Structure 1
């Protein structure tokens, strides 16, 4: 039979059933092929695969295996009741809205609970484990800003260009209906989720030959082509909620990745271990980088620019809203998919909404609807398991380097030549957090990530006038 993590039987041999059943069958496939001495060469034959897949299914059926899952029964039940009771809050006037959520332990990668969809009876597609969609702007902290910080190419108060710029094909890089503004901090870039700063960040990574793919593959992401301008905005990427939750698990867990899983162990009746989850922790980002990103992602939620989440949760459960929440939102180019990823030090909860056929949601479906739904979901989870989110706080690792930098440039105050006239770059300052050894460079002319000659003249006009 299939059990929760506490031995309680889920079933003998709905989303839960079919999902845990499917994972187990995959594990039984590997075991059975190995048992029967099937080489990888013969395992490539498609008729052989169908046989061993059918075999794996019957072994579970007419066999006496104990399948131990990571599922927390109380927490998963409560998530089902939340989507039953509160699912309808997602419906935004563009048809029935589908949903997928995964709740993951940050220290193990274990999946404690999930939401497969609005209602298994009406639609069986598994939106937590099977559906794959662009993660949109939630790509940014992982693939762009996170890597640039880790490479010591950027710190927390570094300045980026959000000046209008075009893709290679002459099209304006857009952010809803805006073609861009001017220079801005990483903080503002993340809080608003502007697109141009992420484009430049990724361009810079390519220019420095960074092994971006090495980072992503260490987190289990399969991206077929890295040579894409809109990659950091989610272009050319498609992920399940379970896999993408694993990325945010990595950032939340001070940069150490643990592979997601639902099955922890399968035993024969007599105790033989057919399968057991083996942990393989990987330091994907430096502790400095991850803890710096946590600080930035904390302000993403607290600024409330792209999500009402903290307001929604404050009202439902103000004590829970005082835990140390960080998170990032995502919106695809036509409002086809909305993401909201949330973490406390203990747990990450991933969330996607969208339509199965990929037509648009409303403009506010992620900002308001999904944020409100996920507040209910977070509150249901806590009510069922009152300690599970924890009261720990995210905190800068000691290894973090702090520089005093000029707010205007994001770099150390000093002299720079602005068209002939060697100039004293003065003015008010902030602490910038870096994940290298030396911190922030002295100010340069091209002080920002990205920007055209025209842009930099314009910016320096402003700066120079004070």
Structure 2
């Protein structure tokens, strides 16, 4: 008889010939066994591409585990995962709104190891077996923005923490206006406002700039396990052309939280043969995906995404349920797809990341505040439930700017050092309030240029610069 265990060695079940925990851990055990048998049999790369061969090797892995005498060690923490099960059972109903039963997926990951400590597969496996933590793929919407746009622009030294971006009206190449909610745009805006409010236009110019600088955006995303088939898409940074599991996407956030270092997500740490020989064991392959300056600058922006409360009530929800816990150093980001079909809230302290999705299995609209309110309230309860079952697991550490970060005094108005600039004839002495801007390059921000923001048409600049000029 084979057995699957929790991280401490406690048997989950034995395998032979009714919850997520079983089928998820079994499924991944079987994946690891498949790689092992394919390697053991020296099956070539090209054979493994053949579908009849996959079927055979999948069936062999299943049988091997039924018939072998394997001990399979998972990353799962029995008390935590258990408390998450109870949390979804007790508080799942918070997610229901006008729109039918709202399904849900959550993944609690260790930021230092990528191990998964526990998860919510859905509202109630007995009613609905689909696994919303591991199998469901949905656009991550604006939770894309920190990873693929802003993070990468900072890492490449093309922007800093208080850099300015255009949220002026602009159209996609088809002539349609880029929209956010029901707004065509406003004007210039700091990266912090862009992120707190989740505006779309800033993210659109950010990606566009990366593309014009020839930046290897695919390299970044692939080092995190992301598979995006087409990068040549205007709305990519807003979630367009991307679909991900909660498990994979929680790994993107783990990378930001873990100071820019990726660790591959996993639920199985080891498989042992009857005799004791290691058939599979998880090997740490940390990767510095974003520089420490970049990750830690982003941690600071993401802390404010939550404390500003603009697109999620979370910090308020949690404060009411557990004010001590609410004082941990939470950072995060919300997502909402275009018709409110899917909501995401990703949360991290320095120790842990908690990814969260909700939506309907057949992809129809949630209520309008499903993500802003319902999901945030639910997650605050989940997060409390994890705390009760494992009271120091969240930790009390703060995120903190790496020493390699560079600090620049810049004009609040331009995101850039004070300077002479040419404004149509007349050269101006650009003056006004300064802020500390954080950069992940060598030299900090540049001097103020005419084209000071990320994005913006001529007209936009004319407009922005006349108010700047207006207040000197």
TM-score category (smaller protein): over 0.9
Cα distance, 1:308 vs structure 2: 0.2
* 3-state SS of paired residue (1:388): coil
Cα distance, 1:127 vs structure 2: 0.4
Give the Cα–Cα distance (whole angstroms) in 2 for the partners of residues 45 and 416 of structure 1. 63
Q: For residue 62 of structure 1, what is the aligned residue in structure 2?
A: 67
Q: Normalization by structure 2: what TM-score?
A: 0.98
* 3-state SS of paired residue (1:102): strand
Give the Cα–Cα distance (whole angstroms) in 2 for the partners of residues 408 and 46 of structure 1. 59
Cα distance, 1:36 vs structure 2: 2.9
* 3-state SS of paired residue (1:381): helix
- Structure 1 gaps of 5+ residues are none
Give the Cα–Cα distance (whole angstroms) in 1 for the partners of residues 387 and 371 of structure 2. 22
* 3-state SS of paired residue (1:427): coil
Deviations along 1:167-191, one digit per CA (max 9) or x if unpaired, are 0001110001011101000000000
* 3-state SS of paired residue (2:45): coil
Runs of 4+ in 1 over 6 A off after TM superposition: none
**Structure 1 position 297 matched with structure 2 position 302:** yes
Give the Cα–Cα distance (whole angstroms) in 2 for the partners of residues 37 and 158 of structure 1. 53
Higher mean Cα deviation, 403-412 or 40-49? 40-49
**Structure 1 position 87 matched with structure 2 position 92:** yes
Cα distance, 1:116 vs structure 2: 0.3
Give the Cα–Cα distance (whole angstroms) in 1 for the partners of residues 59 and 398 of structure 2. 48
Cα distance, 1:43 vs structure 2: 3.0
Deviations along 1:265-301, one digit per CA (max 9) or x if unpaired, are 0001210111011110100000000000000000000
Deviations along 1:323-349, one digit per CA (max 9) or x if unpaired, are 000000000011111000000000000
Cα distance, 1:62 vs structure 2: 2.4
Deviations along 1:91-136, one digit per CA (max 9) or x if unpaired, are 0111110100000000000000000000101111100010001000
CA RMSD for the aligned pairs? Answer: 0.8
Aligned residues: 466
* 3-state SS of paired residue (2:12): strand
Cα distance, 1:50 vs structure 2: 1.4
Give the Cα–Cα distance (whole angstroms) in 1 for the partners of residues 202 and 45 of structure 2. 45
**Structure 1 position 322 matched with structure 2 position 327:** yes
Give the Cα–Cα distance (whole angstroms) in 1 for the partners of residues 426 and 253 of structure 2. 46
Deviations along 1:55-89, one digit per CA (max 9) or x if unpaired, are 11111112210000000000000000000000010
Cα distance, 1:37 vs structure 2: 3.4
Give the Cα–Cα distance (whole angstroms) in 2 for the partners of residues 170 and 103 of structure 1. 42
Cα distance, 1:30 vs structure 2: 1.5
**Structure 1 position 211 matched with structure 2 position 213:** no
* 3-state SS of paired residue (1:92): coil
Closer, same or farther in 2 for the Cα pair 1:414/1:86, shift >3 Å?
same
Q: For residue 459 of structure 1, what is the aligned residue in structure 2?
A: 464
**Structure 1 position 396 matched with structure 2 position 401:** yes
Deviations along 1:143-178, one digit per CA (max 9) or x if unpaired, are 000000001100000000000110000111000101
* 3-state SS of paired residue (2:344): strand
Give the Cα–Cα distance (whole angstroms) in 2 for the partners of residues 245 and 369 of structure 1. 20
Cα distance, 1:49 vs structure 2: 2.0
Cα distance, 1:33 vs structure 2: 2.2
Give the Cα–Cα distance (whole angstroms) in 2 for the partners of residues 176 and 263 of structure 1. 41
Cα distance, 1:394 vs structure 2: 0.1
Deviations along 1:392-450, one digit per CA (max 9) or x if unpaired, are 00000000100000000010011101110100100011000000011011000110000
Give the Cα–Cα distance (whole angstroms) in 1 for the partners of residues 58 and 343 of structure 2. 35
Q: Normalization by structure 1: what TM-score?
A: 0.99
**Structure 1 position 138 matched with structure 2 position 133:** no
Give the Cα–Cα distance (whole angstroms) in 1 for the partners of residues 47 and 266 of structure 2. 28
* 3-state SS of paired residue (1:12): strand
* 3-state SS of paired residue (1:122): coil
**Structure 1 position 420 matched with structure 2 position 425:** yes
- Structure 2 gaps of 5+ residues are none
Give the Cα–Cα distance (whole angstroms) in 2 for the partners of residues 320 and 376 of structure 1. 11
**Structure 1 position 200 matched with structure 2 position 205:** yes
